[PDB]
Design a protein around this ligand. Structure first.
Ligand SMILES: NC(=O)C1=CN([C@@H]2O[C@H](COP(=O)(O)OP(=O)(O)OC[C@H]3O[C@@H](n4cnc5c(N)ncnc54)[C@H](O)[C@@H]3O)[C@@H](O)[C@H]2O)C=CC1
Ligand SMILES: Cc1cc2nc3c(=O)[nH]c(=O)nc-3n(C[C@H](O)[C@H](O)[C@H](O)COP(=O)(O)O)c2cc1C
Ligand code: SF4
Ligand code: SF4
Ligand code: SF4
Ligand code: SF4
Ligand code: FES
Ligand code: FES
Ligand SMILES: [Mg+2]
Lengths: 43, 59, 433, 217, 230
C-alpha cells in the first residue's frame, strides 16, 4: 500500500489512433445491432 | 418651411437620392405622383418614371 | 443521534469515489480490489423494480446540475416494449466552466462508470449504453475504452453480462468541441450525426430519444454512484445531507484559493467549511473574499455576506437565489475585476450559443456587447435596468436552458454589485468629459 | 472577440473538389468498425467520428474530405458541411503541426492565464490567430477545457499541460520544437487534481470488496 | 367521442388529440403570431414568436409545437403573452437592417406587420448591427441574407417538399448563416416557392425586383395553362 506514486501513466504513450484501434478491437464483442427496417430515412 | 415647386435632389457625389420606395406615391392625397422603377444597369434601385401632376397637387 | 444538524465531515469509508486522485490502479484488477463489480450478478437478478426502488429511497437527485429526482426520471422508462430498442445515454460532455469532476471519474474510476451503465440499463431495460464524452478528453476516452475492453474480456459486459442472461453493450462516442452538446436533446442530436441543437420538449427522451427510441440521459456522476447505492443500501445514501438533499457530492474549488482542488464531501456542508478545510482558504484570508459562484458559471454569484452561513445543497442555495448547479465553486477575492469576470462568462455563453432560437441567438450577443461596454464604463446608469429587462426577456423564453444560464450571472451581478457598475460609469463619465 | 473565420467556402488551388483525398485501407477498416456501432438504417450517426478520422489522417478538413465522407456514409454533402462548420474541433483551414489552445475563461483568467498567453506569444513571435512561418505552431484561445482545478493550462494535440507558469510553458515549447514530446499533466509537482499540498482526503487505504454490502444481497 | 375539451380565453373547444395550441386557437378565429411555423412544413419551434401563456402555468409554451392538454385554458391576450411577443420582436429587430424602402418585401412583410401589431414602437438597441455576405443560388431567387431571421423555412421546404438537400445552416450563435456553403445553384422545378415562404426580403424574386409595390397591384384570380395540372 502506497500513495506517493501516480498510477495513471498509460496515457503518456497514446498515439492519434488509440481510440479507433480500441474501437476496432471491441468490434468483435458487440451484439448484433437492431435494424430500423430501411437502409436510410431517405429510402 | 415654405412649400412650393417640387424638385428631386441628389447626394453630394451627384447620385440621385430617390430609391423608388413609392412612399410619396402612397401618401399623396391627390394621387398626383406616378412612379415606375427597375434595376439600373449597375443594379441600383432607381426610377424610370417619376411624374407629378402639378394641377392635381394640393401642395 | 438521528436528525443531524451539522454536515461536512465524512471519513474515507463513506466516500464512493475511492480513487479520485488516481493513486491506485484504475484498471480492472485494481477496481475489483476496491469493491467494484462485486455481486453485480445478484443486483441484476434482483430486477429493474428493485433497482428503481433502491434509487428512489436513496433520495438521489441529478448530479448534472438540474437536481431532478433520479428515481422518477429512471422509472419514466419502465414502460413495456413497443418494438423500439431502449437505450441509455451517459452524459460526459463536462462543459461547465469550473467543473472537472466527471473528467476525474472517467480517467481514474472508469469501471465504476461501466458498472453504473450496466446497472442503470438493467433498471431501465436498456439494450445498450452510449457514453458521449467530450472531444477534448482524448486520454480519458481511451482510458474508458481500455476499461470497457477489460470488462468485455472479463464477461462483465456484453452478451450474457456477468451471468444473468442480460445482453448489454457499452459504446463510447466523442464529440467535437461544443458545450451546447451537454444539453440532453442537443447531445442526442449530436449522436445522430446532426448539429448540436436541442429539441423541444415534449416529447421527452423517455418517449422519443436517440434514433427516435426511448432514452434516458444521465450524468456520469449520477450513473457512477448507482452500483454503490444498490450495494451499500440506498438508505445508507439518504443518511447524508439534509432531507431532499441527500448523499455525497464532488466539489471543484477553483479561483482565488490557496489549494484549488477536486474533493468529495457531504452534501449539506457549509461553503465556508468546504473552502477552509479542503481548499486551504481564500487567498489572503477569509476577509479578502469578495464573491463566490457556487455551482458553475450558470449559477448567480453571491457576496461574502451570504457565504458566511450558506449550505452547499440545492434548497439552501435556492434560498440564496443562486442554485447548486454542478457544485463548482469559483472564488474571487477583493483584488479581482468582478465586472470583467462576469463579462468573460457572458462572452463564453456568446461563443457557445448554438443560434437555433431567437432569444438566445440575439439577446446573448446583445448582452455580451452591453457587458463589454459596462467593463469600460462606456454606458449610463439607466442601461443597467435595461440590461436587467433584456435578461428577463431571455430567461424562460428559449428552447434550452443556455439562455437561462446566460441571463442568471448578469442578474446576479446587477443584484449584488450595482454600485460598482455606477462607480465605473461615473469614472468613465468625468474622465472623458 | 469575434469568430474571425468564414463560414462559406471559396474554391482555391489548395482547397477544391479535385484536391486529392482518400482514406487509407486501415482507415477504411476503422470506418467500418465505427459504422458497425450504430443501428442499421442510421448511418448518418457516424459522420462525427469518420469526419474526425479524416482530420486525423490529413491534419485538416478540405472540401474534398467532406465530400468523401458524405459519399461514403451516403448522406447529402450539405449535412456534412453543417457538421464541419458547427463544431470547433474541425479545422477547415490548415493548422500548424502543434496546435496550441489556451483556455481564457474566468476560472483560468483568475489564475493568470494572460501571462501564459503573452509568454507563448513572445516565445513564438506570433499572434493569437497566426501560424509560425515554419508551420509548426498554431496558437488560439479556447473556452473552458474541463481542467479549471488545474488552472492555468493549455492543450497541444490531444494533451493537457496544467498548472502552468511562463517558464514552464516556454520550456514545453522549446522542448516540443526540438523533436521531443513533453509529458502531459500538471507542472507543479502535483500530477493530479489533489490539493496542492497535504492530501486532505482519501489518506486511508481503500476498503475491500463487500465492505458495506447490505443484508439480503 | 375522442375529442377533448380545451379552453381558449375561457371558451370551450372540442379538439382531436395531438392538436397543438396554435390549431386550437385558430379553431376560434385567433391567429397566433408566427415566423417559423408553416402548416405544410415540419415544426421548427425556433422563432419563438408563438409563445403563449397557459393558465396556472408559470412558463409560456410554444403554441406551434405544444399539444393541447385536457382542461387547459389558453390566454392568447394576457400580459405574459404580450410581453413575450414584444421581447421576441425586439430580439428579431435588434440586428435587422434598415432596408424597408429598398426592400421588395415592403408592404408585404410579416416582420413589418407583426411588429406593428404585436411589437413595441421604439428601440433601445444602442450597438452596431451584423452584416452577412450574400449568396448566389441562381437567376430566379435573389438573396440578401442580412434580412434573414433564421426561421429555416426555406431549408425545410427544400428538404421535404422539393427533395433537394442543398440548403442548410453554417456556423453557430449569432454568426449562423443560411446557405449552401459553396457556390451552388438551387435548381428545382419548384425552387421559386421559397420566395413566397420566406417571411422577409432575404429571398425575393429577381425578375420582379424593384418594379412594383403590393398596394399598387390589382389581383386577378386565374388558372395556369403551362401544364395540365391547372
Ligand atoms: N455539468 C455541466 O457541465 C453543466 C450543467 N448544467 C446544469 O444543467 C441544469 C439545467 O439543465 P436542464 O436539463 O435544462 O434542466 P430540466 O429541469 O429541464 O431537466 C433536467 C432533467 O430532468 C428531466 N425532466 C425534467 N422534467 C421532466 C418531465 N416533466 N418529465 C420527464 N423528465 C423530465 C429531464 O429529461 C432532464 O433529464 C442547469 O441547472 C445546470 O446547472 C449546465 C451546463 C453545464
Ligand atoms: C447549455 C447546457 C449545457 C449542459 N451541459 C451539460 C454537461 O456538460 N454535462 C451534463 O451532465 N449535463 C449538462 N446539462 C444538463 C443535462 O441535461 C444533464 O446532464 C442531464 O439532464 C442529466 O441530468 P441527471 O444527472 O439529473 O441525470 C446541460 C444543460 C444545458 C442547458
Ligand atoms: S419613391 Fe418617393 S418617397 Fe421613395 S425615395 Fe423616391 S421620392 Fe422618396
Ligand atoms: S437557448 Fe441558445 S443554445 Fe439553447 S436552443 Fe436556443 S439558441 Fe440554441
Ligand atoms: S424584410 Fe421587411 S422588415 Fe426587413 S427590410 Fe424588408 S420590408 Fe423591412
Ligand atoms: S432565408 Fe428566409 S426562409 Fe430561409 S431561414 Fe432566412 S428568413 Fe427563413
Ligand atoms: S476555465 Fe480553463 S479549463 Fe475551465
Ligand atoms: S411559430 Fe412557434 S416558435 Fe416559431
Ligand atoms: Mg420572401
Amino acid at each position: 500500500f502506497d500513495n506517493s506514486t501516480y498510477r495513471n501513466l498509460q496515457h503518456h504513450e497514446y498515439s492519434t489512433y488509440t481510440f479507433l484501434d480500441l474501437n476496432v478491437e471491441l468490434s468483435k464483442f458487440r451484439m448484433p445491432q437492431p435494424s430500423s427496417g430501411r437502409q436510410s430515412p431517405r429510402h | 418651411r415654405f412649400r412650393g415647386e417640387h424638385a428631386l435632389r441628389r447626394y453630394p457625389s451627384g447620385e440621385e437620392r430617390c430609391i423608388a420606395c413609392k412612399l410619396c406615391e402612397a401618401v399623396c392625397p391627390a394621387q398626383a405622383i406616378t412612379i415606375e422603377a427597375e434595376p439600373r444597369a449597375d443594379g441600383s434601385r432607381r426610377t424610370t418614371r417619376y411624374d407629378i401632376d402639378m394641377t392635381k397637387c394640393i401642395y | 443521534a438521528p436528525k443531524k444538524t451539522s454536515f461536512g465531515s465524512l471519513k474515507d469509508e463513506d466516500r464512493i469515489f475511492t480513487n479520485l486522485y488516481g493513486r491506485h490502479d484504475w484498471r480492472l484488477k485494481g477496481a475489483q480490489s476496491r469493491g467494484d463489480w462485486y455481486k453485480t450478478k445478484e443486483i441484476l437478478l434482483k430486477g429493474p423494480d428493485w433497482i428503481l426502488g433502491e434509487v428512489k429511497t436513496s433520495g438521489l437527485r441529478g448530479r448534472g446540475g438540474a437536481g431532478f429526482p433520479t428515481g422518477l426520471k429512471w422509472s419514466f422508462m419502465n414502460k413495456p416494449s413497443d418494438g423500439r430498442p431502449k437505450y441509455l445515454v451517459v452524459n460526459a460532455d463536462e462543459g461547465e466552466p469550473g467543473t472537472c469532476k466527471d473528467r476525474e471519474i472517467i480517467r481514474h474510476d472508469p469501471h465504476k462508470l461501466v458498472e453504473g451503465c450496466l446497472v442503470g440499463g438493467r433498471a431501465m431495460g436498456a439494450r445498450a449504453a452510449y457514453i458521449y464524452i467530450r472531444g477534448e478528453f482524448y486520454n480519458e476516452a481511451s482510458n474508458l475504452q481500455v476499461a470497457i475492453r477489460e470488462a468485455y474480456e472479463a464477461g462483465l459486459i456484453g452478451k450474457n453480462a456477468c451471468g444473468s442472461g442480460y445482453d448489454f453493450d457499452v459504446f463510447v462516442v466523442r464529440g467535437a468541441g461544443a458545450y451546447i452538446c451537454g444539453e440532453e436533446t442537443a447531445l442526442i442530436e449530436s449522436i445522430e450525426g446532426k448539429q448540436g441543437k436541442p429539441r423541444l420538449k415534449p416529447p421527452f427522451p423517455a418517449d422519443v430519444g436517440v434514433f427516435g427510441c426511448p432514452t434516458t440521459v444521465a450524468n456520469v456522476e449520477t450513473v457512477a454512484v448507482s452500483p454503490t447505492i444498490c450495494r451499500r443500501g440506498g438508505a445508507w445514501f439518504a443518511s447524508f445531507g439534509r432531507e431532499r438533499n441527500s448523499g455525497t457530492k464532488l466539489f471543484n474549488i477553483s479561483g482565488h484559493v490557496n489549494h484549488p482542488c477536486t474533493v468529495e464531501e457531504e452534501m449539506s456542508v457549509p461553503l465556508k467549511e468546504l473552502i477552509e478545510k479542503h481548499a486551504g482558504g481564500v487567498i489572503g484570508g477569509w476577509d479578502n473574499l469578495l464573491a463566490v459562484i457556487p455551482g458553475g458559471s450558470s449559477t448567480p454569484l453571491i457576496p461574502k455576506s451570504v457565504c458566511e452561513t450558506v449550505l452547499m445543497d440545492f434548497d439552501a442555495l435556492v434560498q440564496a437565489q443562486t442554485g447548486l448547479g454542478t457544485a463548482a465553486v469559483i472564488v474571487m477575492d477583493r483584488s479581482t475585476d468582478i465586472v470583467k469576470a462576469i463579462a468573460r462568462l457572458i462572452e463564453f455563453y456568446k461563443h457557445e450559443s448554438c443560434g437555433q432560437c431567437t432569444p438566445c441567438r440575439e439577446g446573448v450577443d446583445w448582452m455580451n456587447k452591453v457587458m463589454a461596454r459596462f467593463v469600460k464604463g462606456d454606458a449610463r446608469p439607466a442601461e443597467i435596468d435595461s440590461l436587467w429587462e433584456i435578461s428577463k426577456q431571455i430567461e424562460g423564453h428559449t428552447i434550452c436552458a443556455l439562455g437561462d444560464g446566460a441571463a442568471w450571472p448578469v442578474q446576479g451581478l446587477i443584484r449584488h454589485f450595482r454600485p460598482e457598475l455606477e462607480e465605473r460609469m461615473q469614472q468613465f463619465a468625468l474622465q472623458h468629459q | 472577440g469575434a469568430g474571425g473565420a468564414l463560414f462559406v467556402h471559396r474554391d482555391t488551388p489548395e482547397n477544391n473538389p479535385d484536391t486529392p483525398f482518400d482514406f487509407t485501407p486501415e482507415n477504411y477498416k476503422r470506418i467500418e468498425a465505427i459504422v458497425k456501432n450504430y443501428p442499421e438504417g442510421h448511418k448518418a450517426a457516424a459522420v462525427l467520428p469518420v469526419l474526425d478520422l479524416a482530420q486525423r489522417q490529413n491534419g485538416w478538413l478540405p472540401i474534398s474530405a467532406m465530400n468523401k465522407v458524405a459519399e461514403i456514409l451516403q448522406v447529402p454533402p450539405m449535412r456534412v458541411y453543417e457538421v464541419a462548420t458547427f463544431y470547433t474541433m474541425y479545422n477547415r483551414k490548415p493548422v500548424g503541426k502543434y496546435h496550441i489552445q489556451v483556455c481564457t475563461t474566468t476560472p483560468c483568467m483568475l489564475r493568470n492565464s494572460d501571462s501564459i498567453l503573452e509568454a507563448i506569444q513572445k516565445k513564438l513571435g506570433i499572434k493569437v490567430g497566426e501560424t509560425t512561418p515554419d508551420k509548426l505552431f498554431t496558437l488560439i484561445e479556447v473556452e473552458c477545457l474541463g481542467a479549471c482545478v488545474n488552472a492555468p493550462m493549455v492543450q497541444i494535440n490531444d494533451n493537457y499541460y496544467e498548472d502552468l507558469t511562463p517558464k514552464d510553458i516556454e520550456e514545453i515549447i522549446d522542448e516540443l520544437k526540438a523533436g521531443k514530446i513533453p509529458k502531459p499533466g500538471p507542472r507543479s509537482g502535483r500530477f493530479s487534481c489533489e490539493p496542492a499540498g497535504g492530501l486532505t482526503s482519501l489518506t486511508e487505504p481503500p476498503k475491500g470488496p463487500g465492505f458495506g454490502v447490505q443484508a439480503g444481497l | 367521442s375522442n375529442l377533448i375539451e380545451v379552453f381558449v380565453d375561457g371558451q370551450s373547444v372540442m379538439v382531436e388529440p395531438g392538436t397543438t395550441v396554435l390549431q386550437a386557437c385558430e379553431k376560434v378565429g385567433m391567429q397566433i403570431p408566427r415566423f417559423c411555423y408553416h402548416e405544410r412544413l415540419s415544426v421548427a419551434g425556433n422563432c419563438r414568436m408563438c409563445l403563449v401563456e397557459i393558465e396556472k402555468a408559470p412558463k409560456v409554451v410554444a403554441a406551434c409545437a405544444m399539444p393541447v392538454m385536457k382542461g387547459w385554458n389558453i390566454l392568447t391576450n394576457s400580459e405574459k403573452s404580450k410581453k413575450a411577443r414584444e421581447g421576441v420582436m425586439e430580439f428579431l429587430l435588434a440586428n435587422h437592417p434598415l432596408d424597408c424602402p429598398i426592400c421588395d418585401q415592403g408592404g408585404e412583410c410579416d416582420l413589418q406587420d407583426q411588429s406593428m401589431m404585436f411589437g413595441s414602437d421604439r428601440s433601445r438597441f444602442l450597438e452596431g448591427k451584423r452584416a452577412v455576405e450574400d449568396k448566389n443560388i441562381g437567376p430566379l431567387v435573389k438573396t440578401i441574407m442580412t434580412r434573414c431571421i433564421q426561421c429555416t423555412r426555406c431549408i425545410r421546404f427544400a428538404s421535404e417538399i422539393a427533395g433537394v438537400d442543398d440548403l442548410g445552416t453554417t456556423g453557430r450563435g449569432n454568426d449562423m448563416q443560411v446557405g449552401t456553403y459553396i457556390e451552388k445553384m438551387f435548381m428545382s422545378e419548384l425552387s421559386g416557392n421559397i420566395i413566397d415562404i420566406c417571411p422577409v426580403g432575404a429571398l425575393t424574386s429577381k425578375p420582379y425586383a424593384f418594379t412594383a409595390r403590393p398596394w399598387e397591384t390589382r389581383k386577378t384570380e386565374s388558372i395556369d395553362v403551362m401544364d395540365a395540372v391547372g
